[PDB]
């Protein structure tokens, strides 16, 4: 199973961004592939918060547009929504303990826990994920 | 059941902050009360992220200290950690739809969903929570 971060969804959706052509192709391929594409609820929620956000974009995506994009992706044959498992809280604590996580590292550990609990690859633009030795993390364009 | 926001935990633990005596008493009263104190995993994670944050505090609480406080709160008789339930995703969508949520509203809706799913009172310092008519929200000091 491959799990993806907020950045992968944002690049795939926003045409204005330079990274968009690579991300849109990657997302369509992951969504229609045999391997399940794991989508954490926090990732789906994070993508809506970022695209619709006035601080992030001069012209924010409409919430109605953001929700339709989430709905279409969840519709994809590979897509599986992930809700934190009973294992997610222990996995999050183990990841946080591994790096002595502080500030935003805690947010990363919480996102990372979805991949660790599922033994899934975690795809993120952020290379800070390299910090979690236990985590299986790859650059999305790798 | 009463659910509490990150600010309520943060005020309770930071002696330096002005709100601390009031928040510390309320939190201790909630933790030892018969009505369950519902603590979402996202709220517990958020409290560690804020207390240990270098931008937020000139001297951040240590992660070791932050986790021991979380472990202590969990040990309290009222306290129940909450994981999102089967209805959490639909409840989050309903709250976001109710206010046309955009940007940070999405984060508030996701947190508010733990209270709506559990039919719990949401205690938050933020008065913006009044915008969710479906939510039962009260200021914590009230």
């Amino acid at each position: 199973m491959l799990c993806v971060d907020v950045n992968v969804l944002v690049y795939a959706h926003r045409a204005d961004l330079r990274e968009h052509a690579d991300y849109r192709g990657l997302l369509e391929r992951l969504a229609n592939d045999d391997e399940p594409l794991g989508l954490p609820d926090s990732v789906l929620a994070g993508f809506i918060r970022v695209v619709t956000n006035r601080r992030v974009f001069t012209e924010p995506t409409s919430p109605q547009d953001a929700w339709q994009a989430v709905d279409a992706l969840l519709a994809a044959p590979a897509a599986m929504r992930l809700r934190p498992g009973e294992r997610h809280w222990m996995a999050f604590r183990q990841l946080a303990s591994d790096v002595d996580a502080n500030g935003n590292d805690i947010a990363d550990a919480h996102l990372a826990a979805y991949a660790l609990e599922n033994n899934a690859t975690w795809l993120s633009a952020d290379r800070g994920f390299a910090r979690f030795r236990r985590l299986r993390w790859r650059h999305p364009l790798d | 059941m009463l659910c509490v926001d990150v600010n309520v935990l943060v005020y309770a633990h930071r002696a330096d902050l002005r709100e601390h005596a009031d928040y510390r008493g309320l939190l201790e009263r909630l933790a030892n009360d018969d009505e369950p104190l519902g603590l979402p995993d996202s709220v517990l994670a958020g409290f560690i992220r804020v207390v240990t944050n270098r931008r937020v505090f000139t001297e951040p609480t240590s992660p070791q200290d932050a986790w021991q406080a979380v472990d202590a709160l969990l040990a309290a008789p009222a306290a129940m950690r909450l994981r999102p339930g089967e209805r959490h995703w639909m409840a989050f969508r309903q709250l976001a739809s109710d206010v046309d949520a955009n940007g940070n509203d999405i984060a508030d809706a996701h947190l508010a969903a733990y209270a709506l799913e559990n039919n719990a009172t949401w205690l938050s310092a933020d008065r913006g929570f009044a915008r969710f008519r479906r939510l039962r929200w009260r200021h914590p000091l009230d």
């Binding site: 974009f57 001069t58 590979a78 935003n104 947010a107 633009a125 | 931008r55 940070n104």
Partner: peptide, 28 residues
Amino acid sequence: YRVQPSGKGGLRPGVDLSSNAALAEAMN
């Protein structure tokens, strides 16, 4: 499944999508 692309006008100044910590600071 096909992405339906949307958006125009780019990012606000100083915002980098690549870093979760920076994006979090920019949003609040």
